[PDB]
A paper describes a structure:
Similar to other CoA transferases, acetyl-CoA is bound in an apparent high-affinity binding site in CtfB with most interactions occurring between the phospho-ADP of CoA and CtfB residues far from the acetate binding pocket. The binding site for acetyl-CoA involves primarily CtfB residues that are far from the catalytic glutamate where acetate is bound. For example, E46 CB is 25.5 Å from A146 CB. The adenosine base of acetyl-CoA is wedged between the methyl group of CtfB A146 (chain C) on one side and CtfB L158, I117, and L104 on the other side, shown in Figure 5. M121 extends the hydrophobic patch deeper into the binding site to make hydrophobic contacts with one methyl group of the pantothenic portion of CoA. The second pantothenic methyl group is positioned to make hydrophobic contact with L104. These extensive hydrophobic interactions are likely responsible for the high-binding affinity, but there are also several hydrogen bonds and electrostatic interactions as well. The acetyl-B-mercaptoethylamine group of acetyl-CoA is modeled only in the heterodimer cleft between chain C and chain D. In the chain A and B heterodimer, only the phosphoadenosine group is included in the model. There is 2Fo-Fc electron density for the modeled acetyl-B-mercaptoethylamine group between chains C and D, but the density includes multiple chain breaks and is weak in places. Interestingly, even with the acetyl-CoA group bound, there are two acetate molecules in the acetate-binding site. The shows difference density for two acetate molecules in the CtfAB F42TS45C-CoA structure. Acetate 1, colored magenta, is the only location where acetate is bound in the same conformation in each structure.
CtfAB then transfers the CoA from acetoacetyl-CoA to acetate to reform an acetyl-CoA and produce acetoacetate. CtfAB is a member of family 1 CoA transferases. CtfB contains the acetyl-CoA binding site and the PS01724 signature sequence which includes the catalytic glutamate residue (E46) sandwiched between two short antiparallel beta strands on the N-terminal end of an eight-stranded mixed beta sheet. CtfA contains the acetate binding site and the PS01723 signature sequence.
Author numbering:
A (entry chain A), C (entry chain D): 1 to 213
B (entry chain B), D (entry chain C): 2 to 215
């Protein structure tokens, strides 16, 4: 079955894992999964997410306990500890424009080999990218981003693992659900099959491997 | 009050029916001065069309925030969505206006607003997508950084985009980047043209019908 | 006011227009808009769609009345009249793998310059495509598809033009809504704002220009 | 009967919990023969996970069809979605099995199944994406076309994909394409090995544990 005790994170999230973690500044983030990673000091992580939240919450807890070797994110400005580790050189930070980050994760999830975006052209983001012109306009070729495990947060799952989200807690979660090899969803409520309509489900249960909370 | 001056004038630029995105900080004040006869809708990059004002105490929802994680309301008819859809709206030409803060703008209309090497390194977030994709980009920014001009001949700080922004509004001036360079369109009632020029390093073209406002 | 009488289609769709039309074999297709085009002989059209449905319905009616100069579709096998006009040379047919069609329309809607897909590599679809290798795997560069007007079908619109879809009638409609310059939505019901929740709307009213019933 | 033979054997290949897509024609018969203990979920490219059998008369819904526009039911827990999401499931590796019809399969495991020049020109639809992206591709076809072998050294009809399909099931044979060529794993109880090889233009590797079944 899909629902597992939170201790199962230790079997599924390896030391050194590459992880996609949902949440925008900690909103819609799998807090209980993060707390278990902290409890067992699972480190050397590469975390792909919008941001490193704040020092006191979400992904910021992972940075505070020095569990990330690398973050691939669009924003770190609300976490001075992330910036301090970056400047000291103990944390590698790869900054990705937020829209590009979404499309790069999505490309991995939907089976594309890359996307062309005008975002970042002529900025430092262009460094080490293939530039492709189409119809006289320049685009950066941006490449799919893969991960071992997606750690996502959802409002409800039905008995089959179909997920719905709530308001601005959706953000990166359904995109990362498609893109990682294994998907673990932290959910606030389990509801009967038939409570979530075919027209409203946003992540089908077939792609959700494990559920906690 | 310089921030209020800017926010009031930017709000007067907005048109009925527009979808508008406000950056955190100074641009967020714009929402407090929308002319009563003007209806716009606000988008936040973290995934909402239909952002409303901060909730009354006790009406907060943990899952409903702006792009700074501050609690917001959602107005009737709002839509929330994932980050791919969000930047599809932003990058795809569906956002009428973005109002963003600024560190420098130059005579090419190029904006630098996400990094000062050796000083502030927050990352770009959605700013590069917003400047690249919005139908109209308005930069809302004080005219100088403690006296140092921010409207310069060529940006020395990292660029957010090579797209030419459409309007600069400061507490002293309203400027429109054009193919000939920066066109000064208005100056503040509380300043003078001489002061504006003393505090602008970039070359400015002067409109014939220079106005007073902000 | 977005809602207009259906008889205004002749004012909004020009001869020679490039149109995206929603629907999978006529399911989720704007049948009343199609009937207006037929009634007013709006001809020389280029139609981007999954298919040309059947001779008796949907996009098939446009082909039956010889109103298309060109179709850009993934499938024509259920319409022998499309096949006959293709063979006789009076209708140009551009076949696009269905998943590629979805992503090429999407790319125009979300501001990408193109996408890389493995679909079609080493087939006749590779002809006249740039081939890009990424991590030793070959992809076809597929380019955004633009249109003058999207003619989409939806289940309900609220007073603000927010749209929801129903079951397998969704197909290409919300993608096309993002991609065309002007968007006309045929809907079955207009409902009060607040009937469609923020968590279930699939197309925001801000991108819908006109609505017909 | 040969179509029943094939559909029964293909059904036996499906595993508990898999997401399966059945092409039009012979593969759709597979749903008639799923062993009773085996629970799978079906995807249709037009935008559903959770396809069910045709509705009882009077229970049809005009918005709920398969990829031939025939009325289907949706089972509890189904999800419907747009065509981009649909081909994200298909191209993205989230579909466990696709069962597709065949015109030819060759010694490289390449499938031709969407066009016969000068005859059948339906377009490819989703077939190229399905062969390219499914975790496992099973080709369910008759062994010959009115006596002409369909399992050939090199396809002469237009390829659907350069992906190597994973299994071929005919009324005579079960064949697994491998790096070494085509491995004949089983033959029908109603044929002989020699009859199978005589009706196959491709070279076959005969498994040392050849089995009888389908
Ligand atoms: C958004 C952003 C561009 C500006 O922020 P803002 O809220 O929109 O507007 P502000 O005028 O308050 O600018 C923020 C700070 O950056 C500083 N700053 C602004 N432009 C600068 C420049 N060109 N060089 C150095 N510092 C600069 C300001 O002095 C201000 O400093 P302070 O608040 O600590 O006293 C940042 O990025
Ligand atoms: C590939 C596809 C066309 C096969 O259809 P199917 O229902 O799954 O299986 P079938 O054996 O009935 O093949 C359908 C037709 O294609 C023909 N066909 C199949 N393989 C062929 C080949 N290699 N060359 C020519 N015709 C071929 C069959 O003879 C059959 O012809 P018919 O309709 O006149 O009887 C599907 O789509």
């Amino acid at each position: 079955m899909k629902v597992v005790d939170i201790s199962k994170i230790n079997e599924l999230v390896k030391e050194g894992a590459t992880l996609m973690i949902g949440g925008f500044l900690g909103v819609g983030t799998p807090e209980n999964i993060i707390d278990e990673i902290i409890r067992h000091n699972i480190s050397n992580l590469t975390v792909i997410a919008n941001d490193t939240a704040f020092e006191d919450r979400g992904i910021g807890k992972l940075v505070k306990n020095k569990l990330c070797k690398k973050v691939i994110v669009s924003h770190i400005g609300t976490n001075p500890e992330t910036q301090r580790q970056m400047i000291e050189g103990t944390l590698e930070v790869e900054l990705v424009p937020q829209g590009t980050l979404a499309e790069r994760i999505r490309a991995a999830g939907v089976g594309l080999g890359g996307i062309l975006t005008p975002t970042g052209v002529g900025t430092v983001v262009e460094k080490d990218k293939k530039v492709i012109e189409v119809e006289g306009k320049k685009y950066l070729l941006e490449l799919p981003i893969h991960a071992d495990v997606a750690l996502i947060k959802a409002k409800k799952a039905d008995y089959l693992g179909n997920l719905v989200y709530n308001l601005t807690a959706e953000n990166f979660n359904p995109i990362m659900a498609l893109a990682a090899k294994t998907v673990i969803a932290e959910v606030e409520e389990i509801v009967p099959t038939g409570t979530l309509s075919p027209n409203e489900i946003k992540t089908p249960g077939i792609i959700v491997d494990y559920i906690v909370t | 009050n310089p921030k209020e001056k800017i926010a009031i004038r930017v709000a007067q630029e907005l048109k009925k029916g527009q979808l508008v995105n406000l950056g955190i900080g100074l641009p967020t004040l714009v929402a407090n001065y929308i002319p009563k006869d003007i209806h716009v809708t606000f988008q936040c990059e973290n995934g909402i069309i239909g952002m409303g004002p901060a909730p009354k105490e006790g009406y907060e929802n943990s899952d409903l925030t702006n792009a700074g994680a501050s609690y917001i309301t959602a107005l009737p008819g709002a839509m929330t969505f994932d980050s791919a859809f969000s930047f599809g709206i932003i990058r795809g030409g569906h956002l009428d206006v973005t109002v963003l803060g600024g560190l420098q703008v130059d005579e090419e209309g190029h904006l630098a607003n996400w990094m000062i090497p050796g000083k502030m390194i927050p990352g770009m977030g959605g700013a590069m997508d917003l400047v690249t994709g919005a139908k109209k980009v308005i930069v809302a920014m004080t005219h100088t950084a403690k006296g140092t001009p921010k409207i310069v001949k060529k940006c020395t700080l990292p660029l957010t985009s090579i797209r030419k922004v459409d309007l600069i509004v400061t507490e002293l001036a309203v400027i429109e980047p054009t193919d000939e360079g920066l066109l000064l369109k208005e100056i503040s009632k509380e300043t003078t043209l001489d002061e504006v020029l003393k505090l602008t390093e970039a070359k400015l073209i002067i409109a014939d019908d220079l106005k007073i406002f902000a």
